[PDB]
Amino acid sequence: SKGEELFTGVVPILVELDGDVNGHCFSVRGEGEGDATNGKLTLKFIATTGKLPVPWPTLVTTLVQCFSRYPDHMKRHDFFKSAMPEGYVQERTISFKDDGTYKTRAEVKFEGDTLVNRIELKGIDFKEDGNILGHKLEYNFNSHNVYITADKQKNGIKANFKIRHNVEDGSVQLADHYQQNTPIGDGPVLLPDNHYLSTQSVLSKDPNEKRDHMVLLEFVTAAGITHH
Amino acid sequence: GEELFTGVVPILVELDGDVNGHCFSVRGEGEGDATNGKLTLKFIATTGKLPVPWPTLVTTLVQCFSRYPDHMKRHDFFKSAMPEGYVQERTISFKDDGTYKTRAEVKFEGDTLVNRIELKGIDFKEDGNILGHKLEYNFNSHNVYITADKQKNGIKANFKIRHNVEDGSVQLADHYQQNTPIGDGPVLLPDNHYLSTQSVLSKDPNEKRDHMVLLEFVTAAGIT
Numbered sequence: 221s222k223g224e225e226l227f228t229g230v231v232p233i234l235v236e237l238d239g240d241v242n243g244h245c246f247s248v249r250g251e252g253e254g255d256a257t258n259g260k261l262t263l264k265f266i267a268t269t270g271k272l273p274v275p276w277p278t279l280v281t282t283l284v285q286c287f288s289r290y291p292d293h294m295k296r297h298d299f300f301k302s303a304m305p306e307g308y309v310q311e312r313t314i315s316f317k318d319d320g321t322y323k324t325r326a327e328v329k330f331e332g333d334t335l336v337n338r339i340e341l342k343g344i345d346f347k348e349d350g351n352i353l354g355h356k357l358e359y360n361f362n363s364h365n366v367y368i369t370a371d372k373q374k375n376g377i378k379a380n381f382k383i384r385h386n387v388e389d390g391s392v393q394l395a396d397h398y399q400q401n402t403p404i405g406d407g408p409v410l411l412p413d414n415h416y417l418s419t420q421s422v423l424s425k426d427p428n429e430k431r432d433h434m435v436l437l438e439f440v441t442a443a444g445i446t447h448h
Numbered sequence: 449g450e451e452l453f454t455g456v457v458p459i460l461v462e463l464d465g466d467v468n469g470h471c472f473s474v475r476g477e478g479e480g481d482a483t484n485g486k487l488t489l490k491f492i493a494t495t496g497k498l499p500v501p502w503p504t505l506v507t508t509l510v511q512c513f514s515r516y517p518d519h520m521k522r523h524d525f526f527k528s529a530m531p532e533g534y535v536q537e538r539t540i541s542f543k544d545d546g547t548y549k550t551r552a553e554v555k556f557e558g559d560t561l562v563n564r565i566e567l568k569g570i571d572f573k574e575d576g577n578i579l580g581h582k583l584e585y586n587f588n589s590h591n592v593y594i595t596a597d598k599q600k601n602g603i604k605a606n607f608k609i610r611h612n613v614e615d616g617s618v619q620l621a622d623h624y625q626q627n628t629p630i631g632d633g634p635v636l637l638p639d640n641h642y643l644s645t646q647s648v649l650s651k652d653p654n655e656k657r658d659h660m661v662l663l664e665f666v667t668a669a670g671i672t
C-alpha cells in the first residue's frame with residue numbers, strides 16, 4: 221500500500237550498469253522517468269566508457285518491472301511495487317543460443333525520490349565473430365511475454381522468457397532468460413499467482429548525442445489472469 | 449573549501465582497474481567526518497572476484513577527510529581545492545613485484561564527495577604475493593609524508609605501505625604521489641608535514657558479493 225503509492229505519479233529513474241563480457245569491461249548510465257499507472261517509461265542510456273563491446277539490444281532486458289501497469293483486478297499480484305522503497309534484488313541468467321551467457325545481479329530501489337536500478341553484468345564464452353561480439357544485431361526490438369511465478373520459499377518470484385533479437389542478415393538470435401527476484405528489506409511483500417508481463421520497446425537515437433547511446437521507450441502491462 | 453567538510457559528507461568511490469590484462473571494477477559508498485578524521489566505507493567488486501588482494505587497493509580507494517588540527521589549518525591543501533577538486537596520481541611499486549599506476553579525480557558532485565579512479569597494474573608475478581593472493585586481510589598504520597609542489601600549484605607525497613604476508617613477513621609497497629588542483633581557484637600550499645593513518649578492515653556478514661568494509665582515522669601532524 222505504502223509501496224504502490226510511491227508510483228501514482230511520474231517517477232525519476234536512474235540506471236547504472238557495470239559490465240564485463242569476455243574480459244571487456246564497460247559501463248552504462250541511464251536517466252529518465254516512469255509512469256507506472258499507464259505502464260510507460262522513457263530512458264536515455266549513455267556508454268560512459270567509450271564504445272560498447274556488445275550490441276545495445278542485448279542489454280535492454282537488463283537495463284524496472286515496478287513500472288509495469290498492473291490493472292486494478294491484478295493489484296494483489298504486484299510483487300515489484302510492494303517491495304518498495306527498500307526494493308528487490310533481480311538476478312538473471314541469459315543464454316544466447318549457440319553463443320555466450322550473461323549473468324546479472326541488480327538492485328532496484330529508491331534512493332531519495334529516484335527509482336534506482338544498479339546492475340552488475342558478467343558475460344562469458346562468447347564467440348569472437350558471433351552475433352554479439354561481432355555486432356550483427358539490428359537496432360530494434362520485438363514484443364515479448366515475461367512469465368512470472370511465485371517463489372514462496374524465497375519470499376520472492378521467478379520468471380522465464382525467450383527474447384528474439386533480429387539479426388542483420390535476416391536470421392533470429394534467441395536469448396533465453398531465467399530470472400529471480402528477492403526483497404531487499406525484511407518486511408512483507410505480495411506473492412502473486414502465475415501471470416505474465418507483456419512488453420514493448422522502441423529504440424531510437426538522439427540526433428544531438430555524440431556518445432554511444434540508446435534512447436528507449438517502454439510499454440509494459442501485466443496479464444495472464446482472467447477478468448471477472 | 450574547508451566549509452564543505454564541517455559536517456558528515458556522503459562519499460562515492462568508483463574504480464576501473466586492469467592488472468596484467470585482467471580488468472575489474474570496484475564501487476564504494478559511505479561517509480566522511482573530517483572534523484573527527486573518520487571515514488566509513490563499504491566497497492563492492494562489481495565485476496566479481498578481484499584479481500588482486502583487497503588490501504593492495506586501500507590507498508587507491510580521499511585525504512580531504514583528514515583531521516587537520518586548528519594550528520595546521522593553513523596546510524590543508526586537499527580541502528582548499530574543493531569543490532572543483534584535485535587530480536591524484538600515484539606510482540605504487542611493490543617490492544620485488546609489479547607496479548600500480550593510478551589516476552584519480554576527487555571532487556564534489558552536488559553534495560557527494562566523489563573519488564573516480566583509473567588503475568593499471570604492470571608486470572606482476574603470476575604467483576607472487578599479489579596475483580597469488582598471499583596477503584593477509586588486515587592493514588597497518590602509516591605516515592604519509594607531504595611536501596609542496598609550487599610548480600604544479602599542488603603537493604607531492606611519499607610513503608611505504610607495509611602489507612602483512614601470510615608467512616609472517618612484510619611486503620613493502622612504495623608510494624609516490626602527486627596532487628594537482630582541477631580548477632583555477634587559489635589553494636593552500638603546505639609546509640612539510642605528514643598524515644598519520646589508521647585503518648580497520650572487516651566483512652559484512654550479510655553481504656554475499658566480494659567486498660571490503662573499511663573504517664579509517666586520519667590525522668595531520670608533523671608540526672608543533
Ligand SMILES: [Cl-]
Binds near residue numbers: 585586587
Ligand atoms: Cl585491519
Ligand SMILES: [Cl-]
Binds near residue numbers: 590
Ligand atoms: Cl610509516
Ligand SMILES: [Mg+2]
Binds near residue numbers: 247462463464
Ligand atoms: Mg567504473
